[PDB]
Amino acid sequence: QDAITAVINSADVQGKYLDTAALEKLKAYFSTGELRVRAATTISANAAAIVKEAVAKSLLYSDITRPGGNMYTTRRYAACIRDLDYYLRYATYAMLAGDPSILDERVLNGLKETYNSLGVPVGATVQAIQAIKEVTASLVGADAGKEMGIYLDYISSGLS
Amino acid sequence: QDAITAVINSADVQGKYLDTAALEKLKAYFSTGELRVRAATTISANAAAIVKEAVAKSLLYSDITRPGGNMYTTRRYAACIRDLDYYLRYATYAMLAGDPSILDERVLNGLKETYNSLGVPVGATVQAIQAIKEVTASLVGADAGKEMGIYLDYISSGLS
Amino acid sequence: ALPLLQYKPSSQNHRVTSFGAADQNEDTPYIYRIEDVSSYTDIQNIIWASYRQVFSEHEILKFNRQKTLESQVKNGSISVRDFIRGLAKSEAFYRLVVSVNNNYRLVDITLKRLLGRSSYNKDEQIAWSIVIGTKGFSGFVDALIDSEEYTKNFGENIVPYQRKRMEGRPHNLVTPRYGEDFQEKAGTVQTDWRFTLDKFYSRKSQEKQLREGDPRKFADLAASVGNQGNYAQRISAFDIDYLNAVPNR
Amino acid sequence: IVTKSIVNADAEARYLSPGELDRIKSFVAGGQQRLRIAQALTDNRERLVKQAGDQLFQKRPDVVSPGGNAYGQEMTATCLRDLDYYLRLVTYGIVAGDVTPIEEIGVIGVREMYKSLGTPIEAVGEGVRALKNAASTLLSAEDAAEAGSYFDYVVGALQ
Amino acid sequence: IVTKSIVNADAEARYLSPGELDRIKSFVAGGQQRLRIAQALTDNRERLVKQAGDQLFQKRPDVVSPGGNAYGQEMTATCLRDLDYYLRLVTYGIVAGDVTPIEEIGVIGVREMYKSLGTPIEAVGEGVRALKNAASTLLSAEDAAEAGSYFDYVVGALQ
Amino acid sequence: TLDVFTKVVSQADSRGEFLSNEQLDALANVVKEGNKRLDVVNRITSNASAIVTNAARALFEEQPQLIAPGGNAYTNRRMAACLRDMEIILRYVTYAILAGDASVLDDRCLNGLRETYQALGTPGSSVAVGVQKMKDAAVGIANDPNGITKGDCSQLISEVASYFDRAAAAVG
Amino acid sequence: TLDVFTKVVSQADSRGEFLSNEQLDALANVVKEGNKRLDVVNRITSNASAIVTNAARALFEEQPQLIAPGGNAYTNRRMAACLRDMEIILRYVTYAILAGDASVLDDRCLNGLRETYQALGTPGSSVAVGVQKMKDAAVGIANDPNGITKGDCSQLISEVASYFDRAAAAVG
Amino acid sequence: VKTPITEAIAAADTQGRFLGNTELQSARGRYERAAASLEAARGLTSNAQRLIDGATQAVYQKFPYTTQTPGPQFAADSRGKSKCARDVGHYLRIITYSLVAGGTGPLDEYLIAGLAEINSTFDLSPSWYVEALKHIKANHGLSGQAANEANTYIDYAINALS
Amino acid sequence: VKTPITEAIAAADTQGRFLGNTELQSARGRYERAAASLEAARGLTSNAQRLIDGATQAVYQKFPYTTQTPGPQFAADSRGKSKCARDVGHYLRIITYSLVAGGTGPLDEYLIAGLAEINSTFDLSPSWYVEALKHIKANHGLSGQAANEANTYIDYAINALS
Ligand SMILES: CCC1=C(C)/C(=C/C2=NC(=C\c3[nH]c(/C=C4\NC(=O)[C@H](C)[C@H]4CC)c(C)c3CCC(=O)O)/C(CCC(=O)O)=C2C)NC1=O
Ligand SMILES: CCC1=C(C)/C(=C/C2=NC(=C\c3[nH]c(/C=C4\NC(=O)[C@H](C)[C@H]4CC)c(C)c3CCC(=O)O)/C(CCC(=O)O)=C2C)NC1=O
Ligand SMILES: CCC1=C(C)/C(=C/C2=NC(=C\c3[nH]c(/C=C4\NC(=O)[C@H](C)[C@H]4CC)c(C)c3CCC(=O)O)/C(CCC(=O)O)=C2C)NC1=O
Ligand SMILES: CCC1=C(C)/C(=C/C2=NC(=C\c3[nH]c(/C=C4\NC(=O)[C@H](C)[C@H]4CC)c(C)c3CCC(=O)O)/C(CCC(=O)O)=C2C)NC1=O
Ligand SMILES: CCC1=C(C)/C(=C/C2=NC(=C\c3[nH]c(/C=C4\NC(=O)[C@H](C)[C@H]4CC)c(C)c3CCC(=O)O)/C(CCC(=O)O)=C2C)NC1=O
Ligand SMILES: CCC1=C(C)/C(=C/C2=NC(=C\c3[nH]c(/C=C4\NC(=O)[C@H](C)[C@H]4CC)c(C)c3CCC(=O)O)/C(CCC(=O)O)=C2C)NC1=O
Ligand SMILES: CCC1=C(C)/C(=C/C2=NC(=C\c3[nH]c(/C=C4\NC(=O)[C@H](C)[C@H]4CC)c(C)c3CCC(=O)O)/C(CCC(=O)O)=C2C)NC1=O
Ligand SMILES: CCC1=C(C)/C(=C/C2=NC(=C\c3[nH]c(/C=C4\NC(=O)[C@H](C)[C@H]4CC)c(C)c3CCC(=O)O)/C(CCC(=O)O)=C2C)NC1=O
Ligand SMILES: CCC1=C(C)/C(=C/C2=NC(=C\c3[nH]c(/C=C4\NC(=O)[C@H](C)[C@H]4CC)c(C)c3CCC(=O)O)/C(CCC(=O)O)=C2C)NC1=O
Ligand SMILES: CCC1=C(C)/C(=C/C2=NC(=C\c3[nH]c(/C=C4\NC(=O)[C@H](C)[C@H]4CC)c(C)c3CCC(=O)O)/C(CCC(=O)O)=C2C)NC1=O
Numbered sequence A, B: 001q002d003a004i005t006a007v008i009n010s011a012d013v014q015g016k017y018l019d020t021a022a023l024e025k026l027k028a029y030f031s032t033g034e035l036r037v038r039a040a041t042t043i044s045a046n047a048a049a050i051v052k053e054a055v056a057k058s059l060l061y062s063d064i065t066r067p068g069g070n071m072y073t074t075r076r077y078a079a080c081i082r083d084l085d086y087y088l089r090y091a092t093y094a095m096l097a098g099d100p101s102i103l104d105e106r107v108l109n110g111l112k113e114t115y116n117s118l119g120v121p122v123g124a125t126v127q128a129i130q131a132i133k134e135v136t137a138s139l140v141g142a143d144a145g146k147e148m149g150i151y152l153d154y155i156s157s158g159l160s
Numbered sequence C: 001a002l003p004l005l006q007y008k009p010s011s012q013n014h015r016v017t018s019f020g021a022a023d024q025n026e027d028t029p030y031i032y033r034i035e036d037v038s039s040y041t042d043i044q045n046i047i048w049a050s051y052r053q054v055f056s057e058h059e060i061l062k063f064n065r066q067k068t069l070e071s072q073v074k075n076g077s078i079s080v081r082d083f084i085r086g087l088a089k090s091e092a093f094y095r096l097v098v099s100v101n102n103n104y105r106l107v108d109i110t111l112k113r114l115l116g117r118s119s120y121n122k123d124e125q126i127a128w129s130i131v132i133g134t135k136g137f138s139g140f141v142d143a144l145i146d147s148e149e150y151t152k153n154f155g156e157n158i159v160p161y162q163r164k165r166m167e168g169r170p171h172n173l174v175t176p177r178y179g180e181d182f183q184e185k186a187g188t189v190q191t192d193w194r195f196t197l198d199k200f201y202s203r204k205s206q207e208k209q210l211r212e213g214d215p216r217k218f219a220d221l222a223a224s225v226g227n228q229g230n231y232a233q234r235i236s237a238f239d240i241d242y243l244n245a246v247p248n249r
Numbered sequence D, E: 001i002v003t004k005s006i007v008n009a010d011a012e013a014r015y016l017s018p019g020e021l022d023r024i025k026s027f028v029a030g031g032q033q034r035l036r037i038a039q040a041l042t043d044n045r046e047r048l049v050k051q052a053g054d055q056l057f058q059k060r061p062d063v064v065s066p067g068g069n070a071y072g073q074e075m076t077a078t079c080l081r082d083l084d085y086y087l088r089l090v091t092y093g094i095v096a097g098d099v100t101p102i103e104e105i106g107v108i109g110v111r112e113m114y115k116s117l118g119t120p121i122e123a124v125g126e127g128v129r130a131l132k133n134a135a136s137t138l139l140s141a142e143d144a145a146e147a148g149s150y151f152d153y154v155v156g157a158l159q
Numbered sequence F, G: 001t002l003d004v005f006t007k008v009v010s011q012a013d014s015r016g017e018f019l020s021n022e023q024l025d026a027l028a029n030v031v032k033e034g035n036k037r038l039d040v041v042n043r044i045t046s047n048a049s050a051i052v053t054n055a056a057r058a059l060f061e062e063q064p065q066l067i068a069p070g071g072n073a074y075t076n077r078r079m080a081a082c083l084r085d086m087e088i089i090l091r092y093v094t095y096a097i098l099a100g101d102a103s104v105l106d107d108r109c110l111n112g113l114r115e116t117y118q119a120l121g122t123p124g125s126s127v128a129v130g131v132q133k134m135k136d137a138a139v140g141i142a143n144d145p146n147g148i149t150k151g152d153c154s155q156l157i158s159e160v161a162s163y164f165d166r167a168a169a170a171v172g
Numbered sequence H, I: 001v002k003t004p005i006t007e008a009i010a011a012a013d014t015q016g017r018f019l020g021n022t023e024l025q026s027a028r029g030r031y032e033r034a035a036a037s038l039e040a041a042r043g044l045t046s047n048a049q050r051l052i053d054g055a056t057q058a059v060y061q062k063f064p065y066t067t068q069t070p071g072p073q074f075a076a077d078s079r080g081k082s083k084c085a086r087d088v089g090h091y092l093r094i095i096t097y098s099l100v101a102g103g104t105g106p107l108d109e110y111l112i113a114g115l116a117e118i119n120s121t122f123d124l125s126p127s128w129y130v131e132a133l134k135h136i137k138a139n140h141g142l143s144g145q146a147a148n149e150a151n152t153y154i155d156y157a158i159n160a161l162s
């Protein structure tokens, strides 16, 4: 769903026409879409650098990459990079849509089930998503970093 | 957690002493605590009036209070008032702490699970929290209404 | 500017002679005349009964009364026909009737008060409603008192009155200063709870009470649309000749 | 139109390509004209349903005829309510910029619905054509073009 | 943007949408400015490529180190030719509006290629980022946003 | 006859309370935008006679049987009848923009209009095709800036056009 | 009904020339002196009912046979008759100060008033003893140095008192 | 009802002509004063409860017999004092109503229309209400040109009383 | 005759009441526009002779047959051209008269009253005079708010012509 599609749905289930508050919501979305698109472009620029800096901030040189940790095996390191790239990409989609429903529908659906099945540590994942959020808020600026951090904190809060 | 306790924790997990950036953060918190306390006092003044005005703005005279809606039964109306009072009270706690972690720990933990279990409409709850935010930003002023709306929008974003 | 469209006059009481003077009842009004002065009681009665026709008794009050036009009437400087023009083209009368009523109902309410006759049909009310619009209200009140039905029946110096209502209700009583379509705007039927009980079960509330959806909401739109379809063809199916009906190429 | 590009780049493992970002920026720019067109179609709804019923019942009198479906005041009120629904979905598609939230509610299963209701679909298409003509008379040239866009989509969809 | 719209409406059974026709109209309206940007980038080919390559060697001296790939005059000439090729593909993408010319000429199989050539991918990407910065400094401001966002696609797709 | 100033009194009398401070901040914006309102009004009345015939170049050209023999705008008095009250629409719409509320317009201009227009035999729907053609020319004049200081009167333009849409709804 | 603005038009029409520049400099002082007229005018009308009874007591206390049995102010409607038109002097003098020229005063209080006052038998000279008592109270209120700001109202005060002297001359 | 914007309309409507510059000019004048008139409305609304009980105990001073004489009309009984603050509190409403309207219309239509009829029947002497309004116009604490603004409409109710 | 000071009087006189604040509001309002209206009077009086012969030769341009057709009504010989500058010169007088009066009164009473009667009898087409007044409103050289001021009354004479 969108913010546009959410506004249209909320006006639809009442049978209501588009009143002035919904037009205010759509015009606010059409105002913010500029920096939304520019932020999505520069996040699509260097996603690999963001994931590299995030694991170098949070996960590297810990016991997690040591033997016994969950990132010791090299296929598990590759799976870690894959999961962080997923979090960043779906946070980019939720930032450009302006509605976190795609995070609820595609990422946060059965994810705690999987992470408790595999024995994946949840707190280290939350700290890695936090480091992702700090790196991309530094990279994109504060004004779009707020909206990026909202959906990354949404993923972090639903994960916990 | 606090903003003080978050600064102390972020300095602690590195083994770092209190450097000048952390002292800047604590001194900014000690500057803003004045209007934090005054805002918390006047929100504790008339919380019932805020909840009444919010349901009169958003939820009343809709289909939600009509039969078939989720607020038709009078125990469900009382549960609605209880949930809105919870959102306002925990937003007051997060405003005075200056850190949204208590919202993540006490409100937003298993709340989407409950609201999808009971069949509670989520979008009407988001619009009710929005009306709460507008009423208390009018009541407290713009300067503390920004910080109140930050945590109320945090509840709204985590709920969605 | 443009002349009056011709409207049909319905048969009413006052188009008839009613012969004689010594024969009519008591209940014909007192035909108060400024030429009859003889006292101040006749002078005060002429002023008060001229307010009676214009403001329907209750309003005369104190404030509404224009004291300078009554100042003048005693002197005799201005005729009674001129004096009704002062009461009718007065904004104490504008706020009371003219703003409040409609151009179609104003024609009905000022003929009963200045000419003393009800309008014949709706076509007469339709006819003068244009003369209100382009000339203004005081231009139309001027046209009523200049009119030859006024001067023939009342004259220059006689207060108006209902002509020949042998078996009819009195005109200040049957007609208020505002009707039912305007009643919510000047009256207080919105805030009185006695009337909301009657509108509670009114057929108009049931059209409001229904939720979004149902074709009963669009039932008023369906009557305005019209466009009924044609009936089936009268020609029988045996006269079709389907084998030779097909055109080649 | 943002959900379209998002699921479009989401089926792929790639990000949103910046040409899609350009089309989102251009739609964001045109959103104000979209909102004015939607409000102009919003406030004048009953005129459009009146003129659509006018032109339809002048065009096809069989719905008026008693063998047709829209016979009587109740059935003709349901008919104009259907035209009201389609005008509402057209305003939704005008705001959304792409025909997904109007096809999801009015197009995707309409043929079997109108088949098991007895009504012909061609008369509904003529009704949306009459709505397009009345809105073309109501709007300016660059507004009627952009409204006749989505009206044209509905007319092509009902056939 | 015409090819992508046509193949997207080809995957469905339907025609081109009114939204998509608005996209084509806006692309035609911006096409002359895109030809101006292509004019500037064509005429600034030399100094943009040389400044970007020398910015790369300032950032990454590993390639021109004797253990690196771009050691020697001929190898560094081929390095600058690779940057020339990528700037040419960026101009093609700015003109077309799609990134399908950039993709199917220089993106789609470049990882396996530069793996077999021994060349690091990230230094290519840093050189195209230097091209983005140089062409951003040459052009007008929001025009540079347009050019640098196609450059941004190339940079993100190389890594 | 009501206003923006007097209608926010009249509902405030019905509830019987003093006027709130946010109603006075609302009326302070009404005074603030008053100068803009006046300028729009003077341009309509100065081009008042130019609008009516330019609407009559299309009100009769689009439905040409009306002046052709048989139509209700055929003879000359009948033709001068739909110019004697095409302007009365403009006479009361300009009163509505001056007062700022459509309550003045409703009482006289449209209260009995739809009743006479089936009593006479005139097409009621053939009025509101051309009152829309007045609105297309009225907001074109009121928005255009000629010898005027630059300003934004967009809000007035939309609710100037709302008065024409109310003027077309109760006739059609 | 004439003005200061309209009377300098009306003689300028009779000679048929354009308005001279020193007439426009004269009217520019009238606009400049315009604010003072309103201030003087509002104080008279706000103390309008307080003047008449205060003026009135002197009017009857000085000539005490008038309300004593036999005088023309004796009975009660006769007494209310010289309060119903003691104020009409103030009703038209305030119109004269508003217009700034006594040409609206001389059609209502000065035109036929001396004719009715002979036929009526009411003393005519016993009016102008008390219209002077109104002027003594009118210029005392208009010239009081209370509130507002200090300014020169002397020119207005003298030709405010000239309107009362014209109001007393055509009755006596 | 009487308003300078309304008075421009009803003058131009009875002539059947458009809005000239003479009706339009009148509207322009109202705005300059309406900026200072809304200053006078907030000065009376904020000090409303001080002014009512400031007034209804000032009338008891000059007329001490009104709290002593046993009569339906008299305010000596508590029920009269309950109807005291109702009536004087009705005056400050209509004064504040005629402030923001700019004209005397709401004062002319709600308060003083037919006031001589009602005060004769219920024997309410109008010397009582004029004593309360003199207390209001001296104790509102308003200053500047806004102090002139409330002072006209209070004094306009005074002259209509007597 | 129609003037905002007069319109306050004739409204309050027909009611038989005093001057309220609603009649008295207009006078205050009128002075502010009258300060900019007298600016427009000097702009037309000083440029009077340029504007008349600027106008009466502009109407000869758009209507060249008016100097050619032999008729008493047409301006063929010098006697029509002598009555040309009289008639167009009469218009700038009344426009300047209605400027300083503030209302449309002198324009309503001297110029446009009974203009449809006279133009039908002498066959003077009113399309001639409206062509001269469009030349005046574009070539007076006035600026600012005073340029708006003359532009209303010129356009008010235009609508009364047609
Ligand atoms: C789009 C949303 C989405 C997510 C997130 C997802 C995750 C996901 N992570 C997995 C494994 C894994 N996930 C992790 C990740 C972590 N472990 C740690 O220590 C770190 C805290 C964290 C990385 C930041 C690791 C190490 C494995 C390897 C377990 C294994 O395969 O043996 C698996 C098992 C199979 C596979 O990777 O291919 C799934 C399905 N699937 C999804 O569809
Ligand atoms: C401190 C954080 C916190 C929250 C929010 C919370 C909510 C909560 N809301 C509940 C029910 C409910 N919650 C709602 C609320 C709503 N439904 C609507 O239609 C509106 C959109 C919305 C009100 C704004 C209603 C109507 C029920 C009644 C369901 C029922 O009991 O039958 C229940 C079920 C049992 C009970 O109320 O006593 C819980 C636990 N518990 C918590 O600990
Ligand atoms: C120009 C069209 C026109 C007509 C016809 C008309 C009739 C009319 N007939 C009347 C009375 C009357 N009409 C009759 C008539 C009759 N009695 C009988 O037995 C016969 C059957 C019948 C006559 C043939 C009677 C008896 C009265 C007096 C009834 C009463 O006063 O109770 C009256 C009331 C008194 C009056 O004459 O003013 C009117 C107005 N007015 C009009 O403007
Ligand atoms: C917003 C998406 C949506 C659509 C499309 C929709 C269609 C719809 N059309 C219906 C009936 C109807 N629809 C029509 C339609 C027509 N009259 C004609 O002759 C033409 C063929 C056509 C319109 C001009 C008629 C005549 C009925 C009543 C048929 C019956 O009662 O059996 C009904 C059943 C009655 C009702 O509950 O309204 C539905 C659900 N409902 C929806 O919620
Ligand atoms: C239009 C799409 C396209 C590309 C991209 C392309 C690249 C390309 N690069 C080559 C070599 C090369 N490419 C580089 C590149 C680099 N030096 C570095 O360290 C940097 C990371 C990078 C500069 C960006 C070097 C050093 C060689 C020489 C390697 C050799 O000769 O073995 C060659 C083989 C020799 C040749 O034919 O020129 C090809 C085909 N060809 C194409 O048709
Ligand atoms: C102040 C509000 C107001 C309005 C608007 C109004 C209209 C109105 N128009 C009328 C006639 C008319 N109305 C029209 C107008 C039209 N007919 C056409 O052919 C055209 C389609 C259309 C104009 C666009 C015509 C030509 C007449 C004369 C018809 C006749 O004489 O039969 C009549 C009946 C006769 C009349 O007095 O002139 C009224 C009452 N009256 C009012 O009080
Ligand atoms: C009753 C006689 C009268 C008129 C006519 C009048 C108009 C008038 N319009 C003004 C301003 C203005 N008027 C407009 C109007 C507009 N600008 C646009 O671009 C829009 C299209 C349009 C509105 C639709 C604007 C923008 C201003 C700027 C100044 C202000 O805000 O007042 C001002 C400010 C003061 C001045 O200009 O000297 C005046 C005088 N004042 C008067 O006393
Ligand atoms: C010195 C104390 C005193 C006063 C004040 C007085 C006034 C006075 N004015 C009278 C009449 C009158 N007064 C007026 C005056 C006017 N009517 C208008 O409409 C005009 C606007 C206005 C003049 C400008 C008129 C018209 C009459 C009629 C009777 C008459 O001619 O005397 C009469 C006749 C007898 C009576 O009314 O009982 C009295 C007493 N008599 C006195 O002894
Ligand atoms: C005692 C001798 C005396 C008088 C008479 C006097 C009056 C007076 N009234 C003034 C202002 C004013 N007077 C008014 C009065 C009004 N405007 C309206 O539109 C209302 C209808 C009316 C009130 C009811 C206004 C609006 C002003 C504007 C300037 C100000 O606020 O003082 C000023 C300001 C300074 C000046 O004008 O030079 C003076 C002098 N000053 C004096 O020294
Ligand atoms: C909205 C404007 C408005 C006002 C202000 C108003 C006043 C008003 N006060 C009345 C009576 C009254 N008025 C008072 C007030 C007073 N008497 C005293 O002794 C005190 C001196 C004084 C108060 C300070 C009392 C005590 C009554 C009842 C007298 C009776 O019943 O005879 C009455 C007659 C009976 C009634 O309905 O209650 C009216 C009409 N009416 C209105 O429509």
Ligand SMILES: CCC1=C(C)/C(=C/C2=NC(=C\c3[nH]c(/C=C4\NC(=O)[C@H](C)[C@H]4CC)c(C)c3CCC(=O)O)/C(CCC(=O)O)=C2C)NC1=O
Residues within 6 Å of the ligand: I056, I059, I066, I072, I073, I074, I075, I076, I079, I080, I081, I083, I084, I085, I086, I087, I088, I090, I091, I110, I111, I118, I122, I124, I128
């Ligand atoms: C004070 C305001 C005022 C004006 C302006 C006015 C004009 C006016 N011009 C007239 C004739 C005329 N008007 C003109 C003027 C013109 N004809 C042309 O050919 C030219 C196009 C045009 C001049 C530019 C002429 C030539 C006559 C004489 C026509 C005749 O005698 O039939 C007449 C009728 C006969 C007359 O007394 O002379 C009037 C009343 N009257 C007024 O009271």
